Design a protein around this ligand. Structure first.
Ligand code: CLA
Ligand code: CLA
Ligand code: CLA
Ligand code: CLA
Ligand code: CLA
Ligand code: CLA
Ligand code: CLA
Ligand code: CLA
Ligand SMILES: CC1=C(/C=C/C(C)=C\C=C/C(C)=C/C=C/C=C(C)/C=C\C=C(C)\C=C\C2=C(C)CCCC2(C)C)C(C)(C)CCC1
Ligand SMILES: CC1=C(C/C=C(\C)CCC[C@H](C)CCC[C@H](C)CCCC(C)C)C(=O)c2ccccc2C1=O
Ligand code: SF4
Ligand code: SF4
Ligand code: SF4
Lengths: 80, 141, 105, 105, 730, 163, 64
């Protein structure tokens, strides 16, 4: 039940998508960049709040931020 | 993909003696995950929970309690052996859900069908202060 | 009582004798032990921000390092703690024993 | 299974070993020294160690006939004095030596 | 279970239970909140804290009257020890009840340390009946407040938001009535009751109307001859209870202490709270409220803007900032209350206000230490609650160009200068202490760097102390400041300050110099840790938007080199360690300097406080002899309870090191292993938790470990302070 | 005198402390022989101790009731009562040395940053340049006021801020 | 030409940036209507280790 918002400064590196294990980020076409790509966060219900993605973002400041919030079974990474 | 592949719950599993990292009471009650892939030969691979196991030529199937345990294995197979796995989510009611290649193409490659979600059309920062939203939830949305 | 509060009399009263070095190391070891607590209890976030406000003054006077200052890494912070922690914890005994036993009883 | 079974032992020891120390402290402060764990008290003596001390002490007679004496005097015997100071003398094990040997485990 | 928050109730783990308690009284973040419902819920809750106060006081009176020796203490206050409450512990043995029954009472008891006996005796309480009657009075007042918190929450009797945001009416009613009239009445009590009770006369509800306080009555008050009430003051040879050596005065300006009871004259304190009532009533008629006259608060702030522009817009825009921000109003109140709490500590030990308090050495310590420790805790809250204002209740566009934005603009200069002061104070103070530790050790105690605090000795000479020989204005008979106040206060004041057997302006040496400098280092660094967490609360270069996350969060991740302990909560977290360190030094310096005075050997502190080994040898190790022998293998004394607590603190302090050093990730993997065992066990698996077990969160452990850390840092000293002073009785 | 302190020459405890510290060595000197090296070592320590006490008395120091010398910090009382060498004069001695370290390091930083790869110059110093600046800093106060009055000391809002 | 010249130094004006009121070389500029075309390179690294970032026209200004 975490929140994942991506901002206007994305450049279509795809390093955020390759990093986050839980497949919570995918690439969508867009007209704003040279690469003509942008990220997205359709399924944040599966977000474990690891925050690996933010590390991948190579911009001056993060175009992808994971604002932690209410917890859940999927978010707490509980096998039980 | 062209069409979602339905689950074949009766396929041969790898040759693995067993371990203690398996499934717990949560699996029967709440949900569990299963992963499928197709190998060309008999090989050895590291399991996320436990030790080593031997794949089987043809389809293979595992059961896990977490999505990270499954995707951890996809990254190993896609890199080491260069395969194309696909995994589902099974609830206690018997319902099945097809998760990771939901469009058939992996998320790190674009596709025309996809639609953006949680996309702010502004720069990081450049957003209202919390005082403006002091009595309801959210400064980022 | 009978081990610490008693056998610590030879170390404390070492000032003015040949065992004076053990009395100093007895205190010095307590300093390094506590000093470790800054590293174990805190985190690299508070320190990296503090250096920014310090870099401003070093920048204001045009005296700043080309090698940017960065706070100690999380793993290093933990290592630096246990090192100064063990050193102070072990060196105390090294002073509390040799002074006690050289001045026999 | 390893970490689980080993977790149970640590909790077993810390309670039954360290908790015995607190029991003696609480009994003494309340004025009930008869209820402590001590020699004049609810003795817990290490029988296994005491038996091994005598066995190694009475070895020259039977198990090692050509041995003129025992390996050390810690097992048993008489004092060895040098320069007015004792070099080694038999060490006796009691209720305290039972708690400490367990504290180490 | 949390009804105020649905987000936590859906949580299946134990994090729901812990976070439900900590976010309980944080009304702003609750679900479905409104600004109007917020003030009402606060107004009702503030009635509650009053209810516990008046009940807590009622419990002390009852438990003292029923179980204490107040009747026996007044007859021989010096020798008899007070009694706080009795003891019933069935786990005792026979030697303990024989040791703990030191008091005259039959069963075992606890000796008091607060000083309420000296306080109640001074204001005119001389019986246990009068305490029973009082305990009922506050319990009634306590129930009345509980009824009000419920009453003033109902649909009717529900104050509107405009009523809360009426500052001009609150000041006038609170300054005039709560402060002034209360201070006026307390003078009415000291005059009509207490001063007679000192001079033998028994005044009570039966006879307070018939008995006059003064022989003349009120006719001097109307005629204007107000000096008639200061004619025949009490003589020096005056017993505090009997009429031997008494007088007729009710208001006087004698100054100094009473000879027998080394305490302030009652007639002075009566005269004191009168003048305070006059200024505070006058100040109450200042602001404007429903009449044409009066000042306005907003008009004043807008006016005090300097023309040149050193402060820019100045104090404009601040009224709506303060009046709308509750955290702003709370930081100022704690800042003011925290400081006052230190004054109560500094000004009581030097100027004893109560009878036979200077003689009770154990009681002076506890009160000074308790006020000083609370001072730091209250002060920390003012900054912390000041940092929350910058996140939640700060609007930059409204507060543009004003003093508050101009401070936040150049914060890199403030934090830089603060850091320099702490570094310079810390390096020099540690150096002087080390240089003397060594040079003592090599047998040369004359090579020490002992610097005399000339500036402070200059003051004491300018305030009557003729020892140093500076011959300042008020130490000189020719000056006018000596001439003025010569008939009023100086004969009583000069006698006390020059007496070197009281705590009024103690002699100062080079050892007191280093201790004061060490304190300054602690105060400056503690502020730097807090100030930084406030100004950098909104954003840092490492985290440009902290304001979006909140006051308290884990970290922003292992990226950007590491962001662990950035939040403003983590600054407050680190300051408490320093706070305790600072108050420790302040308090260690009070105790030892007073022990040497009480033991008579002042040379102990002057020669040994210049090097650190003196603090470890002569203060800590030496005075921890009678305490540590509380329960010996031979027997047990009455100090066994303190030695047990002594260790209890040493232990709690160490348990916090676990939560501080060892983090979460080691433990959650461990709890996953116990979970496996609970399910695979044959019979225990039938039992299953309702809420899933997980390790404690990151922020929770910082809090928990600090509690185990501070409680050990208090329970250890309290035992050492009381046991060291009680066993020697001096 | 001032502050109720006696001079160290007139004090009794000061001489008491001298007779004590010498008695320890005389007792320690009895064990060894006259012509041995331990004897020569202790006699030197005796000679130094006798010199330490007389020199502190000759310097007009102030000893308290404990018998140890005290220092005075206000320059007014220091100059009035002839106690300036204690604190007031040590302050100027240190500031000249502290300023020298600053003026030197500030110049090495500025000059290396005018060239390529200044990061390498910090870990691998230019020792010929460092010695040149280190022997040119004798008149560091002149250059500071020269640089302040000129205005090339401080930077002007070309620095990073955070909000 | 839409923007600053190649190889020209410029000063940044993003308040969020590590390089704020600091100078960097212009590596390139795109003239296809992108929101953040101006590519800039600095010598000093940021906290992560990146020494480049795409800035906008309004966010950059002339040196010193
Ligand atoms: C004095 C401080 C202190 C204490 C009390 C403990 C206690 C414990 N530690 Mg820690 N340790 C400490 C310091 C301390 N540690 C510090 C500072 C560090 C930092 C390195 C560590 C790091 C650490 C690690 C990493 C681990 C432990 C483990 C343990 C647990 C081992 C199991 C056990 O023996 O429990 C037995 C119970 C006791 C020892 C308590 C003794 C007191 C008595 C017996 C309790 C009396 C209860 C009373 C009768 C009931 C009153 C109820 C009341 C409400 C009415 C135990 C609870 C291990 C663990 O938890 O896993 C098993 C674990 O692996 N320790
Ligand atoms: C007039 C006094 C006053 C008032 C009205 C408030 C009001 C408030 N404070 Mg504040 N505060 C104060 C003084 C005050 N504070 C002081 C003096 C400090 C400094 C210590 C603080 C520090 C402080 C912090 C740091 C925070 C608040 C927060 C809050 C909010 C409520 C949080 C809540 O429900 O916690 C309920 C909490 C509990 C019920 C847990 C308290 C448990 C304590 C620590 C355990 C004590 C030890 C134990 C009982 C000892 C027993 C001994 C044993 C041997 C038996 C609320 C606005 C919070 C807030 O606004 O969040 C945004 C917040 O984060 N306050
Ligand atoms: C005298 C102190 C005091 C006062 C006045 C209150 C007052 C209140 N508490 Mg509180 N509380 C206190 C101490 C206090 N509490 C302590 C020490 C704890 C820890 C055990 C709690 C734990 C607590 C919880 C868990 C809850 C309250 C709630 C409430 C509110 C219930 C409405 C009546 C009320 C404002 C309830 C609430 O939030 O009502 C809005 C609630 O759910 N309190
Ligand atoms: C907050 C106020 C306060 C406090 C802290 C106490 C505290 C105590 N009272 Mg007490 N009491 C109080 C107010 C208070 N009283 C009032 C107002 C009354 C009048 C009804 C009483 C009447 C009372 C009786 C009649 C008894 C106590 C007893 C006790 C002790 C029992 C242990 C316990 O859990 O409690 C304890 C020292 C019991 C005891 O044995 O004390 C030693 C006992 O028998 N109290
Ligand atoms: C600051 C004001 C103040 C305070 C704190 C005291 C305190 C005290 N007085 Mg005193 N007194 C005062 C003013 C004050 N007096 C004035 C102005 C006079 C002149 C008439 C007296 C005359 C006086 C006499 C003659 C006697 C006392 C006594 C007492 C003691 C016991 C009272 C008791 O148990 O309640 C008993 C209470 C009652 C019998 C009823 C009181 C009725 C008043 C009007 C109610 C006030 C309630 C107030 C509004 C509460 C605040 C909460 C509010 C929101 C409801 C106590 C030390 C008695 C004693 O033994 O002292 C040595 C005693 O005999 N007083
Ligand atoms: C940041 C540096 C610093 C700080 C925070 C303090 C703080 C304090 N000093 Mg102090 N002091 C300092 C430096 C400092 N001092 C220096 C460098 C000297 C000369 C060696 C002294 C000599 C001194 C004496 C003799 C006494 C104090 C005393 C005190 C306490 C009361 C204030 C006072 O009247 O002293 C004076 C305040 C100052 C001298 C401010 C000057 C600080 C300058 C600007 C820094 C150094 C500049 C550099 C030398 C050029 C107080 C807590 C008194 C005390 O001990 O209380 C009983 C007292 O008797 N100080
Ligand atoms: C492993 C053995 C051991 C350990 C771990 C501890 C640990 C502790 N003891 Mg302790 N103690 C021990 C053995 C031990 N003790 C023995 C054998 C005895 C004799 C029987 C004592 C007697 C004792 C007493 C009487 C007290 C402690 C206290 C404490 C606690 C103080 C911690 C702190 O940081 O406060 C702060 C540390 C300091 C303020 C500095 C320490 C003392 C310095 C030298 C004073 C300097 C003050 C002065 C201003 C100079 C400093 C300024 C600086 C700039 C130069 C601490 C947890 C104290 C306590 O309960 O905590 C409040 C306490 O009063 N112990
Ligand atoms: C030329 C080097 C240099 C210069 C000119 C300055 C100058 C300054 N520093 Mg500083 N600093 C330096 C190096 C330097 N620093 C280094 C290497 C460190 C890391 C330990 C720091 C850490 C530091 C802190 C934490 C603080 C300052 C602060 C300050 C300001 C107040 C003075 C002070 O008390 O600082 C402190 C002095 C030291 C910590 C001693 C520095 C170590 C040596 C003595 C200096 C290094 C000289 C260099 C290695 C020699 C190279 C010469 C070259 C020819 C080879 C001041 C403008 C304070 C401030 O912010 O101002 C308000 C402050 O809080 N500095
Ligand atoms: C962050 C924040 C904050 C902060 C706070 C604080 C913390 C403050 C402070 C502080 C304090 C707490 C202070 C105090 C003080 C005091 C003072 C400053 C004083 C003084 C002085 C004087 C004027 C004096 C005089 C005199 C007399 C009267 C007589 C005799 C002589 C003498 C000199 C003593 C706030 C909330 C605000 C807001 C925002 C946020
Ligand atoms: C031991 C430990 C745990 C695990 C500790 C646990 C699970 C103990 C808490 C549960 C026990 C059962 C409560 C014990 C009862 C208390 C003595 C009394 C509590 C009183 C309250 C109800 C008021 C953490 O989760 C943790 C998290 C982060 C940093 C450090 C640590 C850490 O050190
Ligand atoms: S990691 Fe950042 S820059 Fe790269 S594609 Fe994602 S949002 Fe864009
Ligand atoms: S929080 Fe973790 S799991 Fe979720 S999107 Fe970011 S990196 Fe992926
Ligand atoms: S708080 Fe823990 S998880 Fe967060 S950055 Fe620090 S070490 Fe890593």
């Amino acid at each position: 039940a975490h929140v994942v918002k991506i901002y206007d400064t994305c450049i279509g590196c795809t390093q955020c998508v390759r990093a986050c294990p839980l497949d919570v980020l995918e690439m969508v076409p867009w007209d704003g960049c040279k690469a003509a790509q942008m990220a997205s966060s359709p399924r944040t219900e599966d977000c474990v709040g690891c925050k690996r993605c933010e590390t991948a973002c190579p911009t001056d400041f993060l175009s992808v931020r994971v604002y932690l919030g209410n917890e859940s079974t999927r978010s707490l990474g509980l096998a039980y | 993909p062209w069409k979602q592949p339905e689950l074949d719950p009766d396929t041969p599993s790898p040759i693995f003696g067993g371990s203690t990292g398996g499934l717990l009471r949560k699996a029967q009650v709440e949900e569990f995950y299963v992963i499928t892939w197709e190998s060309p030969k008999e090989q050895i691979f590291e399991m996320p929970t436990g030790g080593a196991a031997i794949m089987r030529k043809g389809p293979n199937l595992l059961k896990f309690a977490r999505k990270e345990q499954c995707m951890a294995l996809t990254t190993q197979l896609r890199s080491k052996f260069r395969q194309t796995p696909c995994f589902y989510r099974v609830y206690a009611d018997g319902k099945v859900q097809y998760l990771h290649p939901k469009d058939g193409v992996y998320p790190e490659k674009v596709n025309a069908g996809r639609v953006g979600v949680n996309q702010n059309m502004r720069s990081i920062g450049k957003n209202v202060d919390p005082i403006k939203v002091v009595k309801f939830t959210g400064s980022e949305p | 009582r009978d081990f610490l509060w008693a056998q610590s009399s030879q170390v404390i009263q070492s000032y003015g004798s040949a065992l004076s070095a053990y009395g100093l190391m007895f205190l010095g070891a307590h300093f390094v032990w506590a000093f470790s607590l800054m590293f174990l209890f805190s985190g690299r976030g508070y320190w990296q921000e503090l250096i920014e406000s310090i870099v401003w003054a070093h920048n204001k006077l045009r005296v700043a390092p080309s090698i940017q200052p960065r706070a100690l890494s999380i793993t290093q912070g933990r290592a630096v703690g246990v090192a100064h922690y063990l050193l102070g914890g072990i060196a105390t005994t090294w002073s509390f024993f040799l002074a006690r036993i050289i001045a026999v009883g | 299974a390893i970490i689980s079974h080993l977790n149970w032992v640590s909790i077993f020891l810390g309670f039954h070993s360290f908790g015995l120390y607190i029991h003696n402290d609480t009994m003494s402060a309340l004025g009930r020294p008869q209820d402590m764990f001590s020699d004049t008290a609810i003795q817990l003596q290490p029988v296994f160690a005491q038996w091994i001390q005598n066995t190694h002490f009475t070895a020259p007679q039977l198990t090692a006939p050509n041995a003129l004496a025992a390996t050390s005097l810690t097992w048993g015997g008489d004092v060895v004095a040098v320069g007015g100071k004792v070099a080694m003398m038999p060490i006796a094990l009691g209720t305290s030596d039972f708690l400490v040997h367990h504290i180490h485990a | 279970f949390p009804k105020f928050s649905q987000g936590l109730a859906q949580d299946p783990s134990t994090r729901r239970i812990w976070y439900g308690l900590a976010t309980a009284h944080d009304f702003e973040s609750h679900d479905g909140m409104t600004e109007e419902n917020l003030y009402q819920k606060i107004f009702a809750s503030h009635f509650g804290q009053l209810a516990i106060i008046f009940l807590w006081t009622s419990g002390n009176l009852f438990h003292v009257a029923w179980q204490g020796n107040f009747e026996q203490w007044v007859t021989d206050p010096i020798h008899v020890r007070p009694i706080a409450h009795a003891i019933w512990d069935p786990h005792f043995g026979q030697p303990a009840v024989e040791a703990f029954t030191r008091g005259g009472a039959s069963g075992p008891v606890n000796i008091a340390t607060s000083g309420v006996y000296q306080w109640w005796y001074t204001i005119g309480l001389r019986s246990n009946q009068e305490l029973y009657v009082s305990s009922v009075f506050l319990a009634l007042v306590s129930a009345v407040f509980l009824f009000a918190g419920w009453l003033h929450l109902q649909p009717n009797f529900q104050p509107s938001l405009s009523w809360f945001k009426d500052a001009e009416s609150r000041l006038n009613h609170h300054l005039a009535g709560l402060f002034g009239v209360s201070s006026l009445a307390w003078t009415g009590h000291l005059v009509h009751v207490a001063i007679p009770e000192s001079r033998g006369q028994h005044v009570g509800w039966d006879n307070f109307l018939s008995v006059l306080p003064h022989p003349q009555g009120l006719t001097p008050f109307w005629s204007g001859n107000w000096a008639a009430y200061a004619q025949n003051p009490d003589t020096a040879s005056h017993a505090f209870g009997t009429a031997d050596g008494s007088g007729t005065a009710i208001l006087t300006f004698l100054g100094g202490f009473h000879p027998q009871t080394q305490s302030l004259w009652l007639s002075d304190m009566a005269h004191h709270h009168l003048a305070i009532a006059v200024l505070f009533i006058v100040a109450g008629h200042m602001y404007r409220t429903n009449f044409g006259i009066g000042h306005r608060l907003e008009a004043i702030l807008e006016a005090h803007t300097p023309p040149a522009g050193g402060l820019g817009a100045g104090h404009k825009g601040l009224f709506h900032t303060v009046n709308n921000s509750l955290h702003f109003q709370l930081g100022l109140a704690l800042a003011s209350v925290g400081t006052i709490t230190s004054l109560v500590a500094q000004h009581m030990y030097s100027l004893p206000p109560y009878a036979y308090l200077a003689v009770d050495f154990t009681t002076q310590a506890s009160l000074y230490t308790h006020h000083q420790y609370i001072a730091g805790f209250i002060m920390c809250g003012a900054f912390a609650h000041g940092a929350i204002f910058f996140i939640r209740d700060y609007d930059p566009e409204q507060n543009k160009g004003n003093v508050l934005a101009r401070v936040l603009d150049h914060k890199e200069a403030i934090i830089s200068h603060l850091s320099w002061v702490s570094l310079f104070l810390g390096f020099h103070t540690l150096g002087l202490y080390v240089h003397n530790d060594v040079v003592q050790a090599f047998g040369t105690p004359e090579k020490q760097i002992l610097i005399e605090p000339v500036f402070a000795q200059w003051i004491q000479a300018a305030q009557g102390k003729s020892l140093y020989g500076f011959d300042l204005l008020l130490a000189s008979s020719s000056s006018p400041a000596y001439s003025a106040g010569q008939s009023l206060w100086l004969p009583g004041w000069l006698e006390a300050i020059n007496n070197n057997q009281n705590s009024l302006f103690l002699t100062i040496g080079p050892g007191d110099f280093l201790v004061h400098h060490a304190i300054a280092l602690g105060l400056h660094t503690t502020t730097l840790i807090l100030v930084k967490g406030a100004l950098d609360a909104r954003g840092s270069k490492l985290m440009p938007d902290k304001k979006d996350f909140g006051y308290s969060f884990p970290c922003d991740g292992p990226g950007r080199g590491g962001t662990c302990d950035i939040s403003a909560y983590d600054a407050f977290y680190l300051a408490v360690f320093w706070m305790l360190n600072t108050i420790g030094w302040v308090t260690f310096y009070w105790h030892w300097k007073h022990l040497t005075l009480w033991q008579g050997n002042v040379s102990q502190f002057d020669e040994s406080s210049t090097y650190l080994m003196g603090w470890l040898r002569d203060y800590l190790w030496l005075n921890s002899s009678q305490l540590i022998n509380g329960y010996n293998p031979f027997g047990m004394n009455s100090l066994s309870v303190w030695a047990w607590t002594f260790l209890f603190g040493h232990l709690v302090y160490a348990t916090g090191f676990m939560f501080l050093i060892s983090w979460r990730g080691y433990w959650q993997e461990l709890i996953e292993t116990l979970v496996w065992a609970h399910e695979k066990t044959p019979l225990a698996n039938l039992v299953y938790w309702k809420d899933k077990p997980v390790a404690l969160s990151i922020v929770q452990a910082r809090l928990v470990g600090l509690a185990h850390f501070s409680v050990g840092y208090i329970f250890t000293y309290a035992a050492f302070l009381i046991a060291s002073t009680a066993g020697r009785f001096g | 005198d001032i502050a109720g302190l006696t001079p160290c020459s007139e004090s009794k405890a000061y001489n008491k402390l001298e007779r004590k510290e010498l008695k320890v060595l005389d007792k320690r000197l009895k064990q060894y022989e006259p012509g041995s090296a331990p004897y020569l070592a202790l006699q030197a320590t005796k000679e130094r101790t006798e010199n330490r006490f007389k020199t502190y008395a000759k310097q007009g120091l102030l000893c308290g009731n404990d018998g140890l010398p005290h220092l005075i910090s206000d320059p007014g009382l220091a100059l009035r009562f002839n106690h300036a060498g204690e604190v007031f004069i040590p302050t100027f001695g240190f500031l000249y040395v502290a300023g020298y370290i600053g003026h030197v390091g500030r110049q090495y930083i500025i000059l290396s940053k005018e060239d390529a790869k200044p990061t390498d110059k910090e870990i691998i110093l230019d020792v010929p340049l460092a010695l040149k600046l280190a022997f040119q800093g004798w008149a560091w106060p002149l250059a500071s006021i020269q640089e302040l009055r000129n205005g090339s000391l401080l930077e002007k809002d070309e620095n990073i801020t955070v909000s | 030409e839409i923007g600053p010249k190649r190889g020209s130094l410029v000063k940044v004006l993003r308040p969020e940036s590590y390089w704020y009121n600091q100078v960097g070389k212009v590596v390139s500029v795109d003239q296809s209507g992108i929101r953040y075309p101006v590519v800039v390179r600095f010598e000093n690294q940021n906290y992560a280790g990146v020494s480049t970032n795409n800035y906008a026209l309004d966010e950059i200004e002339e040196v010193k």
